[PDB]
Design a binder for this molecule. Structure first.
Ligand code: CLA
Ligand code: CLA
Ligand code: CLA
Ligand code: CLA
Ligand code: CLA
Ligand code: CLA
Ligand code: CLA
Ligand code: CLA
Ligand SMILES: CC1=C(/C=C/C(C)=C/C=C/C(C)=C/C=C/C=C(C)/C=C/C=C(C)/C=C/C2=C(C)CCCC2(C)C)C(C)(C)CCC1
Ligand SMILES: CC1=C(C/C=C(\C)CCC[C@H](C)CCC[C@H](C)CCCC(C)C)C(=O)c2ccccc2C1=O
Ligand code: SF4
Ligand code: SF4
Lengths: 143, 96, 742, 87, 96, 80, 158
C-alpha cells in the first residue's frame, strides 16, 4: 500500500432514484463516496431505501453518511466478498480517502499502526472524578 | 433517459372529446328507473336549471342535484381516466 | 403451470413426549438450558416464531397448519362451553317467553365468600350473571327453543373440537402436507370462496329457510316455544312448512324453472327491522345468505387449478403496471406465496377492518331478535368488535414489518410496486405526519377553543351548533340519499337498510330498537377526531413498516432484526427504532383511538337513539345532551365520564359490584403498566443486584440468575398491562352503566 | 314452464350457443383461452390442459361442457329473472 | 465529467454532484413597472436597514400598547373594559 | 465528538472493530495479550456513540469504553 | 413504449428527491418560477412588496369574519387592525431571520437544471433580506389597508 487509491469518475450503480439520497448537507458540509469492484452484476439494497443494480467492474456511490457507506461495504464484504474503499468529499472539492484508512481493514492487525486512545490499565484503576476536580479534564478516563 | 418528460400528460384532444361525449350520450340515454324515462343527464340538467334561476341561493341540502351530480361526475371521470389509460396503453405495448 | 394435487409425507414426526420433557426444543439457544431468568421469557416469546425455529418453509407451513387446527379446536371448545352454559346454567327458556323484560344470563356463581350477590335478579325465577354476548339473541334467531338443542350442539361442538385437535395431530404427525401443497393459492381461493364461504352461506340459508324462518315466524305470531313444532317436523313435513309460507306447496319447481318470484313470501327484500322483535327480517336474512352463497360460489371458479379455464393470479398481478409504478405488481406473487408473514399482515388488516365493519353494521342493522332492545349486548358487541379490529390492524402492521425485515428480498423486488414505496417513504411519512399534525391541531382546537370560550363566558364564539355551524353536510347528504333509496335508487326494497337514515323510529316494548341518527356539529368534531386518531395510528405503523430495514439514522437496521431495543445512546439516542417499537406506539394510539370511537358510540346512542317511547316523544337515556355538550372536553369529562360513572362507582352491594371491583382493578393495572412504561432496565437490574445480595447472604441464591426484563420485554409488559387496564376499565364502566340504566 | 316455453328456449339457446362458441374457439375453453396469451383478439392453446382427455375431434372436454353449461345457466337466470322483479 | 453515462460525481461540477440546483428560480432582471418600482423604493426608503426596522417595530409596539391601554380597548368595547354593571354575589359561608 | 478508550484487558478478539459501524476502531500490534494485538480508536471523530463495541467486547469488565461528550454532526449521525 | 413518468431529480438517482408531475410539470414549474420569491434577478425589495401585498391582503379576512368583533359593525376595522398587527409581527420575524440566517459563507454555488451557472439570489443575504423585509412591511400594510378599503367599497361584499 504505497499510496491511497485515487478517486476516478467510475460508473454508478443502476438506480431509479429515491427520496433518501443526498440532502443539503452534501452541498454545505460534506458527503461520502463508496467505491467497490464488483465480480458480477447483481442486485443489492441501498442503505437509503430501495434496490439498485451494481455494474460489473468498478462502481461509485455517493451517500450522506459514512455509516451508510460502511454498512453497504460490510454487506458487500460479508455477502459478496468484495473489496471497497470510502472517500469523504467536501463542498470545496477535495476528496479524502477514508476506508480502511490504512489500506488494511482495521479488524486485521497491520504493521505501522500506532495505538490511539489506549489506557494502559484496567477500567477500575481510573482515578475518582473528585481528584481531577477543577481541572481541564474530560473525566477519569482522560487523566 | 432519466430526465423528467415534460409531456407526461400526453393530453390528447381526441381522448378528451371521446371520454366527455361517450359519457354524456349514454348518460343522456333513456333510463326507465327515472320518471318519464328521463336520463341521468336530463334530470341533472333539470336540477341545474331549477337552481340557476336562484343563482346566489345555493341548492337546498335535500335537493336531488347533489346525488345526480355525484352519480354523473363519477361516470364522467371514470370515462376520462379509463379512456386516457386505454389510449396510452394501446399506443404503448401494454395490449398489442 | 404446476398441477394442483394432494401431496403428503407419511409419518414425518413420531408422536412422543420426549420434547415435552425438554423445554425449548424448537430453538438452539433455548435448547441448551436456562442460564438466566431471561430464558423463560425468551422461551415464551419465540414459542410461535416458527420462522426463527426452522429455515425450511415446508416445516413452517406444517406447523402453521396444525397450529390453526389447534386454534380451531380451542374455538370449538369455547363454543361448546357457551352452548353448554346456555343449557344448564342459564334462563334461556324463561327469556324466550319474556325477552323484553328478562335479562339474559348464562353464568351462575358458586355461593362461597359472599360472591353469591353477583347472581343478579335477571328474571324468570332465576339468578346469575347477566350476559352481554348476545348469545341468547343468536340462539333465538337460529330457531333454538329448548335447552336440549343447546346441549346437543354443545356436545357436537366438543366432538368437533376433539376432531379439530385430531386433524392437527394427523396433519403434523401422520399426513403433513408438502410445501407445494400449501402454495396452491389458486385452489385455496377456489375452495375458500366456493366451498367455505359459498357452501357455508348456502347451508346457513337453508337452515334459516327451513328451521329458523318457521320457528321465528311462530314466535313472532306469539306461539309458545314449547308448543312450536320441532325443526325436523318443518324441514321434512312440507305441508307444515307450506302452512306458514304457501310457496312451499310448489316444491322446487319454481327454483329449477327460474320462477323464483313465487318464493317471494319467504325470500324478501323488505329492509328495515321487524317491529315485534326489533331485528332484521329473517326472510331478508335468508335471501341475503342465499345470494351471498351464489355470489361466492360463482366467484370461487375464478382461478385456474387443474383445467385450463380460470385465472393465474401471478399473471393478473404482473399485467397490472403503469407509468407511475414501474414494473407494477410484479414479484408480489412470490412475496405472498413464499412468506407467511406477508399473508398474515394482509389477512389481519382485512380481518380487523372487517370486525370494525361488523360492529358498525350490527348496531345500525340489528340482525337478531330482541338485540337492539337489549342495549347492553348491543354496546358490548360494538365495543368488542371495535377492539378486536384495532388489535388485528396493529398485528397486521407488525407482521408487515416482520415480513419487511425477514422475508423481503431486494433481488426479487427491483422496480415493483413495493420497492418504489420504499424509494419514497420519506415523502409518504412526511405527508402523513403533516396530515396528522393538521388534523390534530384543527380538531383539538375545535374542542380546546370551545373549552376556552365557554370558560371565558363566550358561548357565541364557540363551535357549537348555535354559534358556529360546522355541519357535516356530506354525511347528512349520504343519510338523505339512503333514506330515499327505497323510492328511486333501490325501488324493489320495501324499506331502507337501517332506520338510522331517517323516519319511522323503531320501538319494541317501549324501548327503541332503532332510531334515525342525526349528525350535528358535535358529530363533525368527533368524526374528525376519529380521523385524526386513525391517521396518527397509521403514521406510526406505516413508519415502522417502511423504515423497518433502514433509515437515515440507522442504515444497517435490517440485520439488527425486527425486534431489537435500540442501537445505543449514540446519534443523539436511538431508542425505540425497531419496527416492533413502532407497533408498540402504534398499539398505544390504536387503543387511544378505539377509546374515542366507543365513547362516541356510547354517548351518541344513549343521548340520541336509545331510550323509551311513552307516547309523548322519546325519553332518551341521557336526554339528548350530546349535541350541546360533546363539543367540549369538559362536556365529555362531566356529562359522559363523570355523569355515567355513577352506575359503576355506586354498584357496590348489588350484582354490578363485580363491575365496580373490575373498574378499580383495571385502573390499578393501567397505573401498574405505567411502571414498566416510564422506567428502564438498568435501574431494575441494579435493584435485582441488591436483592440477589440479600438472597446470597442467606444462601437462597437461585441457580437461574435473576435478571431484569429485557428492554423490549419491558415495553411489551408496559403496553400489555396498559391496554388491559384501559380496556377493562372501559369494559366495567360500559357494562355497569348500560346494565343498570337498561 | 314446458318444452318450447320461452324460458326453456332461452336456456337451450344459451347453452347451445356457449358450447358451440368454446368448441370452435370463439370462447375461452379448457384447451384454449387467454392464459399466457398476447392480446385481446387472440387466445392460445393451453399446454397444461392440452390432451387432458376427450373423444371429440376438436378436443372438447367434460370440464368444457360443465363450464359452458354453468355459464349458460347463469346467463339464462339473469335474462329470465329480468322482468320477474316486482318494482 | 458529470454529463457522462452513469456518472454523477465531478469535482469540477461540485454543484451538480451535491445537488445544489436552482429548481424554479429565474434571473430576469425586471418584472415590475419601473415607476412602480421607484414608488415602492421610496415608500421603504429608510426601512431598508435592519436596525431601522428594529426601531420602527419598537416604537410601533410602544404606541400600539399605549393606545390599546388608553383608547383602543375601550373603542373595541371589550367586556373587560366595560364594568361588571351587575349586582355582586356572595360565596358560601356568606363570604363576599 | 465522543471519547473511546481502549484498556489493557483487551484480548485482541477484534469484535469491537468488526462491530463498529463507522470505522473508528482498529487493531494494532501489541505484546500485552496472547493474541498479539490491541484495539485503538484513531478515528474518534467518527464515533456516533452506538456502543456496539462495548456490546461485542467479551472481557469483563469491558476493554473498550465509549464516553459520550460533545455532540457534532457526525456524532449525531445526521444525514442533514 | 412503456413510458415511465417519475424520474430522479435532474437524472441523478443519488440525491434525495424525485421529479414527479407535481414537481416538474411544465404548468407547475411555470407558475412557481413566475412567483416573486423565485425572481432572483429582481430586487428583493419589490419581491417583498408583492409578497407583503398578497399576504397582508388575505390574512385580514380571517380576523374580519371570525374575530371577536365579527358580529359588530366594527368587524372590518377590528379585522384590519388585527391584520396590520400580524403584519408587524411577521416583519419582526423577518428582521430576526435576516439578522441570524445569513451568517455563513455557503461556498458551494448554484446552477439551473439545464446546468447553467447562475449567481446567488441577492434576497439570500443579510442586506438583501433587510430590503425584502422592508418591502414586506410596506406591502403588508398597503394590502391590509386595501382589504379595509374593499370591505368598505366592494358592492357584493357582506
Ligand atoms: C359563480 C359561482 C358562485 C357564486 C358567486 C356563489 C355564491 C354563493 N353561494 Mg354558491 N355554489 C356554487 C357557486 C357559486 N356560489 C357552486 C358551483 C356550488 C355547488 C358546489 C354552490 C353551492 C352552494 C350551496 C349549497 C350554498 C351556496 C351558498 C352561496 C352563498 C354563500 C353565496 C351567495 C349558500 C347560500 O345559499 O347562502 C346562504 C349555500 O347554502 N352555494
Ligand atoms: C370457554 C370455555 C369455558 C369457560 C370459560 C367456562 C367457565 C366456567 N364453567 Mg364451563 N364448560 C365448558 C367450557 C367453559 N366453561 C365446556 C366445554 C364444558 C363441557 C366439558 C363445561 C362444563 C361445565 C360444567 C359442568 C360446569 C362448568 C362450570 C363453569 C364455571 C366454573 C369452572 C369450574 O368448575 O372451576 C374449575 C374447576 C376445576 C379446575 C376442577 C366457569 C364459569 C361450573 C359451573 O358453572 O358451576 C355453577 C359447572 O358446574 N362448566
Ligand atoms: C370446500 C373446501 C374447503 C373448506 C371448507 C376449507 C375450510 C377451511 N380452511 Mg381450507 N383449504 C382447502 C379447502 C377448503 N378449506 C384446500 C383445497 C386447501 C389446499 C390448497 C386448503 C388449505 C388451507 C390452509 C393452508 C389452511 C386452511 C384453513 C381453513 C379453515 C380456516 C378457518 C375458518 O374459516 O374456520 C371455518 C370453520 C369451520 C368451517 C368449522 C369446521 C372446520 C372443518 C375443518 C371444515 C372442513 C373442511 C375440510 C376441507 C373438509 C373435510 C375434509 C377432510 C375430511 C379431509 C377453514 C376451516 C386454515 C386453518 O384454519 O387450518 C385448519 C389453514 O391454515 N385451508
Ligand atoms: C344447503 C342448504 C339446504 C338444504 C340442505 C336444503 C334441504 C332441503 N330443502 Mg331447501 N332450500 C334451500 C337450501 C337448503 N335446503 C334454499 C337456499 C332454498 C331457496 C331456493 C330452498 C328452498 C326449498 C323449497 C322451496 C323446498 C326445499 C325443500 C328441501 C328438502 C327437499 C330435499 C329433496 O328431496 O331434494 C332432493 C334431494 C336429494 C335427491 C338428495 C338425497 C340424496 C341422499 C342423501 C343420498 C344418500 C344415499 C346413500 C349413498 C345410500 C342410502 C343408504 C344409507 C342412508 C344407509 C330438503 C330437506 C323442499 C321441502 O320439502 O321443504 C320442506 C321444498 O319444497 N327447499
Ligand atoms: C392471526 C393472528 C396472529 C398470528 C398468527 C400471530 C403470530 C405471531 N406473532 Mg403477531 N400479532 C397479532 C396477531 C397474530 N400474531 C396481533 C393482533 C398483534 C397486535 C397485538 C400482534 C403483534 C405482534 C408483535 C408485536 C410480535 C408478534 C409476533 C408474533 C410471532 C410470535 C408469537 C409468539 O410466540 O408469542 C407467544 C405469545 C405471547 C408471548 C403473548 C402472551 C399473551 C399477551 C401478554 C397477551 C395476553 C392478553 C390477555 C388476552 C389478557 C388476559 C391475561 C390474563 C391471564 C390476566 C408469531 C409469528 C412476534 C414476532 O417475533 O414475530 C415474528 C412479535 O414481536 N405479533
Ligand atoms: C394529550 C396528550 C398528548 C398530546 C397533546 C399529543 C400530541 C401529539 N402527539 Mg403524542 N402521545 C401521547 C399524548 C399526547 N400527544 C401519549 C401519551 C402517547 C403514547 C406514547 C403518544 C404517542 C405519540 C406518537 C408515537 C406520535 C404522537 C404524535 C403526536 C402529534 C399528533 C398531531 C397532533 O395532535 O396535532 C398537533 C398537536 C396537537 C393538536 C397537540 C395539542 C396542542 C393544542 C391544540 C394547542 C395549540 C396551540 C396553542 C394555542 C399554543 C400556542 C400558544 C402557547 C405558546 C402559549 C402531537 C404533537 C404523532 C406525531 O408527532 O406526528 C404528527 C406521533 O407520531 N404521539
Ligand atoms: C386550529 C384550531 C382552532 C381553530 C380552527 C380556531 C378558530 C378560531 N378561534 Mg380559537 N383557539 C384554539 C384553536 C382554534 N381556534 C386554541 C387551541 C386556543 C387556545 C386556548 C384558541 C383560543 C382562541 C381565542 C382566545 C379566541 C379564538 C378565536 C378564534 C376565531 C378567530 C381566530 C383568528 O383570528 O384567526 C386568524 C387566522 C389566520 C390569520 C389564518 C388562518 C389560517 C388560514 C385560513 C389557512 C389557510 C391555508 C390555505 C388553505 C392554503 C392554501 C394554499 C394555496 C394558496 C396554494 C376562530 C373561530 C377568537 C374569537 O373569539 O373568535 C370566535 C378569540 O378571541 N380562539
Ligand atoms: C340482457 C338481459 C338482461 C336484462 C334486461 C336485465 C335487467 C335487469 N337486471 Mg339482470 N342480468 C343479466 C341480464 C339482464 N338483466 C345477466 C346476463 C346477468 C348475469 C347473471 C344479470 C345479473 C343481474 C343481477 C345479479 C341483478 C340484475 C338486476 C337487474 C335489473 C337492473 C337493476 C340495476 O342495474 O340497477 C342499477 C344499480 C346499480 C347501478 C348499482 C350497482 C351495484 C352497486 C354500485 C354495488 C356494487 C358493489 C361493488 C362496488 C362492485 C364492484 C365493482 C334489471 C331488471 C338486479 C335486479 O334484478 O335487482 C332487482 C340484480 O341484482 N341482473
Ligand atoms: C352434439 C353432440 C352430442 C350432443 C351434445 C350435447 C347436446 C351436449 C350437451 C351438454 C349440456 C346441455 C350440458 C349442460 C350442463 C349444465 C350445467 C353444468 C349446469 C350448471 C348449473 C349451475 C352451476 C347453476 C348454478 C345456479 C344455481 C344452482 C341456482 C343459482 C343460480 C345459478 C345459475 C348460478 C353427442 C354427445 C350426442 C355426440 C357428440 C356430438
Ligand atoms: C418492575 C420492572 C422490572 C422488574 C420485574 C422483575 C424482573 C420480574 C417480574 C416478577 C415476576 C413475577 C418474577 C417471576 C416469579 C417466579 C415465576 C416465581 C414463582 C412465583 C411465586 C411467588 C408464587 C423490570 O425488569 C423492567 C425492565 C424494563 C422496563 C421496566 C421494568 C419494570 O417496570
Ligand atoms: S476491546 Fe473488547 S473486543 Fe475490541 S478487541 Fe479488546 S477485547 Fe476484543
Ligand atoms: S460507539 Fe459505535 S461508533 Fe463509536 S466506536 Fe463504539 S461502535 Fe464504533
Amino acid at each position: 500500500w504505497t499510496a491511497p487509491k485515487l478517486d476516478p469518475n467510475t460508473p454508478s450503480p443502476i438506480f431509479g432514484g429515491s427520496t433518501g439520497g443526498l440532502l443539503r448537507k452534501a452541498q454545505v458540509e460534506e458527503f461520502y463516496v463508496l467505491t467497490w469492484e464488483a465480480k458480477k452484476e447483481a442486485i443489492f439494497e441501498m442503505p437509503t431505501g430501495g434496490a439498485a443494480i451494481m455494474r460489473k467492474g468498478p462502481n461509485l456511490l455517493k451517500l450522506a453518511r459514512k455509516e451508510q457507506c460502511l454498512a453497504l461495504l460490510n454487506t458487500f464484504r460479508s455477502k459478496m466478498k468484495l473489496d471497497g474503499c470510502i472517500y469523504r468529499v467536501f463542498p470545496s472539492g477535495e476528496v479524502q480517502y477514508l476506508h480502511p484508512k490504512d489500506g488494511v481493514y482495521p479488524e486485521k492487525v497491520n504493521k505501522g499502526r500506532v495505538g490511539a486512545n489506549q489506557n494502559m490499565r484496567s477500567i477500575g484503576k481510573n482515578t475518582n472524578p473528585a481528584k481531577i476536580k477543577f481541572q481541564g479534564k474530560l473525566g477519569p478516563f482522560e487523566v | 433517459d432519466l430526465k423528467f418528460d415534460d409531456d407526461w400528460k400526453k393530453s390528447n384532444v381526441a381522448v378528451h372529446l371521446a371520454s366527455l361525449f361517450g359519457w354524456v350520450i349514454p348518460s343522456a340515454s333513456p333510463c326507465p328507473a327515472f320518471p318519464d324515462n328521463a336520463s341521468l343527464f336530463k334530470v341533472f340538467s333539470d336540477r341545474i336549471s331549477e337552481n340557476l334561476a336562484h343563482f346566489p341561493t345555493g341548492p337546498s341540502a335535500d335537493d336531488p342535484i347533489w346525488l345526480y351530480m355525484l352519480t354523473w361526475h363519477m361516470g364522467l371521470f371514470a370515462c376520462m381516466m379509463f379512456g386516457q389509460i386505454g389510449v396510452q396503453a394501446r399506443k404503448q405495448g401494454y395490449f398489442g | 403451470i404446476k398441477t394442483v394435487k394432494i401431496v403428503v409425507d407419511r409419518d414425518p414426526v413420531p408422536t412422543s413426549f420426549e420434547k415435552w420433557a425438554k423445554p425449548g426444543h424448537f430453538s438452539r439457544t433455548l435448547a441448551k438450558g436456562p442460564a438466566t431468568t431471561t430464558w423463560v421469557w425468551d422461551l415464551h416469546a419465540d414459542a410461535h416464531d416458527f420462522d426463527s425455529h426452522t429455515t425450511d418453509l415446508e416445516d413452517i407451513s406444517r406447523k402453521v397448519f396444525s397450529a390453526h387446527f389447534g386454534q380451531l379446536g380451542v374455538i370449538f371448545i369455547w363454543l361448546s362451553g357457551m352452548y353448554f352454559h346456555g343449557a344448564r346454567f342459564s334462563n334461556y327458556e324463561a327469556w324466550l317467553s319474556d325477552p323484553t323484560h328478562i335479562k339474559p344470563s348464562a353464568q351462575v356463581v358458586w355461593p362461597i365468600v359472599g360472591q353469591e350477590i353477583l347472581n343478579g335478579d335477571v328474571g324468570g325465577g332465576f339468578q346469575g350473571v347477566q350476559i352481554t354476548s348476545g348469545f341468547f339473541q343468536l340462539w333465538r334467531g337460529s330457531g333454538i327453543t329448548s335447552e336440549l338443542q343447546l346441549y346437543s350442539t354443545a356436545i357436537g361442538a366438543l366432538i368437533c373440537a376433539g376432531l379439530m385437535f385430531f386433524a392437527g395431530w394427523w396433519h403434523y404427525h401422520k399426513a403433513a402436507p408438502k410445501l407445494e401443497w400449501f402454495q396452491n393459492v389458486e385452489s385455496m381461493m377456489n375452495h375458500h370462496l366456493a366451498g367455505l364461504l359459498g357452501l357455508g352461506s348456502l347451508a346457513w340459508a337453508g337452515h334459516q329457510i327451513h328451521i329458523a324462518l318457521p320457528v321465528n315466524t311462530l314466535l313472532d305470531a306469539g306461539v309458545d316455544p314449547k308448543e312450536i313444532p320441532l325443526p325436523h317436523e318443518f324441514m321434512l313435513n312440507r305441508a307444515l312448512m307450506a302452512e306458514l309460507y304457501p310457496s312451499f306447496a310448489k316444491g322446487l319447481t319454481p327454483f329449477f324453472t327460474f320462477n323464483w318470484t313465487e318464493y317471494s313470501d319467504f325470500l324478501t327484500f323488505r329492509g328495515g327491522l321487524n317491529p315485534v322483535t326489533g331485528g332484521l327480517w329473517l326472510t331478508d336474512m335468508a335471501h341475503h345468505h342465499l345470494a351471498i352463497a351464489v355470489l361466492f360460489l360463482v366467484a370461487g371458479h375464478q382461478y385456474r387449478t387443474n383445467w385450463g379455464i380460470g385465472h393465474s393470479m401471478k399473471e393478473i398481478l404482473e399485467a397490472h403496471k403503469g407509468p407511475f409504478t414501474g414494473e407494477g405488481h410484479k414479484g408480489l406473487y412470490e412475496i405472498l406465496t413464499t412468506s407467511w408473514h406477508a399473508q398474515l399482515a394482509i389477512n389481519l388488516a382485512l380481518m380487523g377492518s372487517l370486525s370494525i365493519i361488523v360492529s358498525h353494521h350490527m348496531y345500525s342493522m340489528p340482525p337478531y331478535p330482541y338485540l337492539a332492545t337489549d342495549y347492553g349486548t348491543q354496546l358490548s358487541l360494538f365495543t368488542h368488535h371495535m377492539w378486536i379490529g384495532g388489535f388485528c390492524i396493529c398485528g397486521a402492521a407488525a407482521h408487515a414489518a416482520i415480513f419487511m425485515v425477514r422475508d423481503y428480498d431486494p433481488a426479487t423486488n427491483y422496480n415493483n410496486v413495493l420497492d418504489r414505496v420504499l424509494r419514497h417513504r420519506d415523502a409518504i411519512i412526511s405527508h402523513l405526519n403533516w396530515v396528522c399534525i393538521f388534523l390534530g391541531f384543527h380538531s383539538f382546537g375545535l374542542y380546546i377553543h370551545n373549552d376556552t370560550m365557554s370558560a371565558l363566558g363566550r358561548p357565541q364564539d364557540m363551535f357549537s351548533d348555535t354559534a358556529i355551524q360546522l355541519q357535516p353536510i356530506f354525511a347528512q347528504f349520504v343519510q338523505h340519499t339512503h333514506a330515499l333509496a327505497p323510492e328511486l335508487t333501490a325501488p324493489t326494497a320495501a324499506g331502507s337498510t337501517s332506520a338510522s337514515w331517517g323516519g319511522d323510529i323503531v320501538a319494541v316494548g317501549g324501548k327503541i330498537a332503532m332510531m334515525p341518527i342525526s349528525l350535528g356539529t358535535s358529530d363533525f368534531m368527533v368524526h374528525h377526531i376519529h380521523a385524526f386518531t386513525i391517521h396518527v395510528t397509521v403514521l406510526i405503523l406505516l413508519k415502522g413498516v417502511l423504515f423497518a430495514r433502514s433509515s437515515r439514522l440507522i442504515p444497517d437496521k435490517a440485520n439488527l432484526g425486527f425486534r431489537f431495543p435500540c442501537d445505543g445512546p449514540g446519534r443523539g439516542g436511538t431508542c425505540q427504532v425497531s419496527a416492533w417499537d413502532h407497533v408498540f406506539l402504534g398499539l398505544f394510539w390504536m387503543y387511544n383511538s378505539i377509546s374515542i370511537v366507543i365513547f362516541h358510540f356510547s354517548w351518541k346512542m344513549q343521548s340520541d337513539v336509545w331510550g323509551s317511547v311513552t307516547g309523548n316523544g322519546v325519553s332518551h337515556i341521557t336526554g339528548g345532551n350530546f349535541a350541546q355538550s360533546a363539543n367540549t372536553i369538559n362536556g365529555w369529562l362531566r356529562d359522559f365520564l363523570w355523569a355515567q360513572s355513577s352506575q359503576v362507582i355506586q354498584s357496590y352491594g348489588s350484582a354490578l359490584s363485580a363491575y365496580g371491583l373490575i373498574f378499580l382493578g383495571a385502573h390499578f393495572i393501567w397505573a401498574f403498566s405505567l411502571m414498566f412504561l416510564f422506567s428502564g432496565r438498568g435501574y431494575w437490574q441494579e435493584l435485582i443486584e441488591s436483592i440477589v445480595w440479600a438472597h446470597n447472604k442467606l444462601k437462597v441464591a437461585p441457580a437461574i440468575q435473576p435478571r431484569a426484563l429485557s428492554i423490549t420485554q419491558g415495553r411489551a409488559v408496559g403496553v400489555a398491562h396498559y391496554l388491559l387496564g384501559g380496556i377493562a376499565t372501559t369494559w366495567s364502566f360500559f357494562l355497569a352503566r348500560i346494565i343498570a340504566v337498561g | 314452464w314446458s318444452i318450447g316455453s320461452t324460458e326453456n328456449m332461452i336456456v337451450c339457446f344459451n347453452t347451445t350457443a356457449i358450447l358451440g362458441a368454446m368448441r370452435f374457439g370463439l370462447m375461452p375453453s379448457v384447451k384454449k383461452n387467454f392464459n399466457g396469451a398476447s392480446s385481446h383478439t387472440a387466445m392460445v392453446e393451453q399446454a397444461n390442459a392440452k390432451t387432458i382427455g376427450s373423444r371429440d375431434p376438436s378436443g372438447f372436454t367434460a370440464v368444457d361442457v360443465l363450464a359452458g353449461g354453468s355459464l349458460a345457466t347463469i346467463i339464462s337466470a339473469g335474462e329470465i329473472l329480468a322482468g320477474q322483479v316486482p318494482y | 465529467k458529470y454529463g457522462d453515462e452513469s456518472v454523477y460525481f465531478d469535482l469540477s461540477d461540485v454543484e451538480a454532484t451535491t445537488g445544489s440546483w436552482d429548481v424554479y428560480g429565474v434571473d430576469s432582471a425586471s418584472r415590475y413597472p419601473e415607476q412602480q418600482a421607484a414608488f415602492f423604493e421610496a415608500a421603504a426608503q429608510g426601512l431598508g436597514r435592519r436596525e431601522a426596522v428594529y426601531s420602527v417595530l419598537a416604537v410601533s409596539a410602544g404606541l400600539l400598547t399605549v393606545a390599546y391601554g388608553v383608547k383602543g380597548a375601550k373603542d373595541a368595547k371589550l367586556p373587560i373594559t366595560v364594568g361588571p354593571q351587575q349586582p355582586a354575589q356572595v360565596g358560601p359561608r356568606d363570604r363576599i | 465528538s465522543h471519547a473511546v478508550k481502549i484498556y489493557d484487558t483487551c484480548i485482541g478478539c477484534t469484535q469491537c472493530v468488526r462491530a463498529c459501524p463507522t470505522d473508528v476502531l482498529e487493531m494494532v500490534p501489541w505484546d500485552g495479550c496472547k493474541a498479539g494485538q490491541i484495539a485503538s480508536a484513531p478515528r474518534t471523530e467518527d464515533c456516533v456513540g452506538c456502543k456496539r463495541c462495548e456490546a461485542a467486547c467479551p472481557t469483563d469488565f469491558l476493554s473498550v469504553r465509549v464516553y459520550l461528550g460533545s455532540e457534532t454532526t457526525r456524532s449525531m449521525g445526521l444525514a442533514y | 413504449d412503456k413510458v415511465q413518468i417519475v424520474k430522479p431529480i435532474n437524472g441523478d438517482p443519488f440525491i434525495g428527491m424525485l421529479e414527479t408531475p407535481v414537481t416538474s410539470s411544465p404548468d407547475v414549474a411555470n407558475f412557481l418560477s413566475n412567483l416573486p420569491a423565485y425572481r432572483t434577478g429582481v430586487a428583493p425589495l419589490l419581491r417583498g412588496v408583492e409578497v407583503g401585498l398578497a399576504h397582508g391582503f388575505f390574512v385580514t379576512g380571517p380576523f374580519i369574519k371570525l374575530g371577536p368583533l365579527r358580529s359588530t359593525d366594527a368587524a372590518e376595522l377590528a379585522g384590519c387592525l388585527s391584520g396590520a398587527g400580524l403584519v408587524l409581527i411577521l416583519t419582526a420575524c423577518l428582521s430576526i431571520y435576516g439578522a441570524t440566517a445569513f451568517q455563513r459563507e455557503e461556498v458551494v454555488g448554484l446552477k439551473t437544471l439545464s446546468g447553467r451557472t447562475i449567481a446567488k439570489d441577492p434576497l439570500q443575504s443579510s442586506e438583501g433580506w433587510a430590503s425584502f423585509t422592508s418591502g414586506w412591511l410596506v406591502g403588508g400594510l398597503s394590502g391590509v389597508a386595501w382589504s379595509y378599503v374593499l370591505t368598505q367599497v366592494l358592492p357584493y361584499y357582506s
